[PDB]
Design a protein around this motif. Structure first.
Motif, short mmCIF file in Angstrom:
data_model
loop_
_atom_site.label_atom_id
_atom_site.label_comp_id
_atom_site.label_asym_id
_atom_site.label_seq_id
_atom_site.Cartn_x
_atom_site.Cartn_y
_atom_site.Cartn_z
N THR A 185 -5.45 2.51 0.41
CA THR A 185 -4.60 1.73 1.55
C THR A 185 -5.55 0.52 2.07
O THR A 185 -5.31 -0.66 2.17
N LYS A 208 -8.06 8.49 9.83
CA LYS A 208 -7.28 7.66 9.13
C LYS A 208 -6.59 6.64 9.95
O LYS A 208 -6.41 5.35 9.63
N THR A 244 0.83 -1.26 -0.04
CA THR A 244 0.04 0.04 -0.03
C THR A 244 0.88 1.16 0.03
O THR A 244 0.72 2.22 -0.67
N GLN A 245 2.02 1.33 0.66
CA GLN A 245 3.01 2.25 0.82
C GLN A 245 3.47 2.67 -0.44
O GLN A 245 3.45 3.55 -1.20
N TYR A 248 -6.80 12.55 1.15
CA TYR A 248 -6.71 11.54 2.08
C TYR A 248 -7.68 10.48 1.94
O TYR A 248 -7.63 9.28 2.44
N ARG A 275 -9.04 9.27 -0.89
CA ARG A 275 -8.47 8.50 -1.97
C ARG A 275 -7.23 7.40 -0.95
O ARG A 275 -7.26 6.24 -1.29
N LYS A 276 -6.52 8.12 -0.28
CA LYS A 276 -5.50 7.33 0.51
C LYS A 276 -6.09 6.48 1.41
O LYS A 276 -5.50 5.40 1.59
#
Lengths: 161, 57, 51, 87
Positions: free
Chosen positions: B26, B42, B12-13, B19, B21-22
């Motif tokens: 993730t 998050k 994932t990283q 965020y 979308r992050k």
RNA sequence: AGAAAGGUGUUAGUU
């Protein structure tokens, strides 16, 4: 240069307190004594007075001895106690090494260091430092290291041997 | 499983949408494999979320 | 083949290499931690701290 | 260390201990009799680490020169060559 | 390099 000074003083038949401390001159010695007395028996500087300030020489300045020095460190935490041994020919000589060493290794200042006691250890068994014991070996013989030695631009390359 | 989760984490990283979308990517990557307030949410999502015999026969 | 083919084949310098790897593991872990950088350094440090 | 001294010819000219070389690390040789008194006068822990390697390296070279045998199953050079051959 | 804690990197000490 540092110098040994014996300071005796008492508050204005109060008990007389005498102690040996190392200062560059008399005025530093008397103030240092008062600060030491202030934190020991809680005697005010203004109230007290000095009755005797004498300079102390080294009785045997040309004889190599080993000095054990107990001191109190002030660090980031401000609380530490150590003991170190130095081999030289004067009590004041070892103290300068003690101050130079700690300002080197531990980044100390003269004010944060207070001498607890300095003694002369004349027994080789009592020595607790490996370097001191090695220097006291009967077969002490080593080549001189770190020699390295206007007239710039010398004619021939140095021998350095 | 913990190593797989670490591998999944390694794989994932506006900022709120970025965020998001992050947050989606993730978790979706973990799902596929299987600002301070926004960052707190998050972290909360991550915190809450966190054959041989046949071959030898 | 079938069942434990590898075990059957073995029965029908590995020790030295394993011993050398085990001995070098102590130095490898220290070197890896010192040479670690980035996010992997934090993960390695966290794993070492947990252990 | 204050003194971490240790032990054909042992001629130590220009730090070369030709019986071989010792220029790489500053340790003395002194060619004390049959031995080579490999002295360290207030050096550094790196010198202490090198002498333990140097003493074995010099001894292995001396042992190899006298009788290197085969050891199939030049000391370091032979072992590295054997490892290279194995690889 | 220099002007929370990790390191089989180092130097001085405490228990």
């Amino acid at each position: 240069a540092l110098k040994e000074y014996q300071v005796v003083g008492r508050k204005v038949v109060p008990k007389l307190f005498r102690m040996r401390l190392f200062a560059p001159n008399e005025s530093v010695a008397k103030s240092r004594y008062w600060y030491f007395l202030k934190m020991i028996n809680k005697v005010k500087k203004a109230t007290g007075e000095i009755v005797a300030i004498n300079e102390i020489s080294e009785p045997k300045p040309l004889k190599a001895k080993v000095f054990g020095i107990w001191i109190r460190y002030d660090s980031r935490s401000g609380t530490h106690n150590m003991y170190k041994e130095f081999r030289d020919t004067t009590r004041v000589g070892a103290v300068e090494a003690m101050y130079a060493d700690m300002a080197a290794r531990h980044r100390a200042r003269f004010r944060s260091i207070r001498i607890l006691k300095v003694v002369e250890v004349e027994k080789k068994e009592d020595v607790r430092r490996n370097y001191v014991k090695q220097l006291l070996n009967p077969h002490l013989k080593f080549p001189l290291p770190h020699r390295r030695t206007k007239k710039v631009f010398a004619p021939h390359r140095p021998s350095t041997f | 499983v913990n190593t797989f989760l670490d591998v999944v984490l390694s794989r994932t990283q506006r900022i709120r949408g970025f965020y998001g979308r992050k947050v989606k990517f993730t978790q979706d990557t973990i799902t596929e494999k299987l600002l301070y307030r926004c960052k707190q949410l998050k972290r909360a999502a991550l915190g809450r979320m966190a054959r041989q015999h046949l071959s030898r026969l | 083949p079938q069942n434990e083919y590898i075990e059957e084949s073995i029965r029908k310098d590995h020790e030295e290499r394993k011993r050398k790897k085990a001995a070098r593991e102590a130095h490898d872990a220290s070197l890896y931690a010192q040479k670690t950088r980035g996010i992997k350094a934090k993960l390695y440090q966290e794993k070492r701290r947990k252990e | 260390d204050i003194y971490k001294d240790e032990t054909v010819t042992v001629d130590i000219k220009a730090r070369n201990v030709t019986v071989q070389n010792l220029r790489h690390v500053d340790i003395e040789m002194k060619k004390q009799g049959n031995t080579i008194k490999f002295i360290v006068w207030h050096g550094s822990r790196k010198h202490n680490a090198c002498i333990r390697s140097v003493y074995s390296i010099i001894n292995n070279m001396i042992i190899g020169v006298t009788q290197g045998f085969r050891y199939k199953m030049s000391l370091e050079n032979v072992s590295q060559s054997a490892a290279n051959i194995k690889q």
